[PDB]
Design a protein around this ligand. Structure first.
Ligand code: BR
Length: 263
């Protein structure tokens, strides 16, 4: 069965793994430690982009608005923000794309400043029905992945359910939904994680996260050849593996999920 298989992977790897596979309507199909708390890491940027798109939907935000910043706003990992900084801004669109596809921390932090900070992202989660996910810090200190710390955390089911509502439910307009989906499909950081375990005929979009204390996470949506729609969340702590082995670990979880996914 599915839960014993993940348990076996936990054993070989001396790792903690949380996984949730959820349907188009948010029902848990298979899970393992699906209700345990893990650090979100950069997976929070997916809901953050969704909040900004929701503000665009409501007319409260303009995709072309200039978000002004200077050198002091940059982060150690902020490859797009470093490129744009001499111009004095990134547009909302450029910040969304950079935060999602590159995981640019400064792009994310510009978006957080615009939505009213970690507390307003937490409120957005609550407004979707997610009872668990919470942001408290800005990037990157939210990556600390400390034991027993509940700041900046979700559960595999919460996040997968949240993402199924965004990607497949009615939270976003058709335009925003389609943009979020296409942005996530063009994610540049996830080729070795969940996608690597899924057949290349399936449409897949994802957002990864890498944290301290061996933290490596991915959440993906996919659409099968039959047209069946799913979200898979994989949250892992594997402080003994090397980075490439942490990505292999996630891909292996995804292979098991692939197996289970059927007509
Ligand atoms: Br992050």
């Amino acid at each position: 069965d599915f839960e014993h298989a993940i348990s076996d992977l936990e054993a070989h790897n001396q790792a903690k793994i949380g996984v949730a596979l959820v349907s188009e309507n948010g029902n848990l199909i298979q899970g393992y430690r699906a209700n345990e708390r893990f650090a979100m890491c950069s997976t929070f940027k997916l809901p953050l982009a969704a909040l900004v798109l929701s503000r665009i939907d409501a007319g409260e935000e303009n995709p072309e608005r200039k978000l002004h910043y200077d050198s002091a706003f940059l982060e150690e990992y902020a490859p797009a923000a470093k490129r744009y900084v001499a111009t004095g801004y990134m547009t909302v669109t450029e910040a969304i794309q950079s935060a999602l596809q590159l995981s640019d921390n400064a792009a994310a932090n510009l978006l957080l400043k615009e939505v009213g900070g970690p507390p307003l992202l937490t409120k957005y989660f609550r407004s979707l029905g997610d009872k668990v996910s919470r942001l408290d810090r800005i990037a990157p200190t939210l990556n600390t992945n400390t034991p027993g710390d509940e700041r900046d955390t979700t559960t595999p089911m919460s996040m997968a359910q949240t993402v199924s509502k965004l990607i497949f439910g009615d939270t976003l307009t058709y335009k925003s939904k389609g943009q979020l989906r296409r942005l996530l499909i063009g994610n540049q950081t996830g080729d070795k994680t969940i996608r690597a375990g899924l057949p290349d005929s399936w449409v897949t979009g994802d957002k990864t996260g890498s944290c301290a204390n061996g933290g490596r996470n991915d959440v993906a949506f996919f659409i099968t050849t039959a047209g069946k729609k799913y979200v898979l969340s994989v949250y892992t702590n594997a402080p003994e593996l090397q980075g490439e082995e942490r990505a292999l670990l996630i891909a292996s979880v995804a292979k098991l999920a692939r197996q289970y996914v059927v007509h």
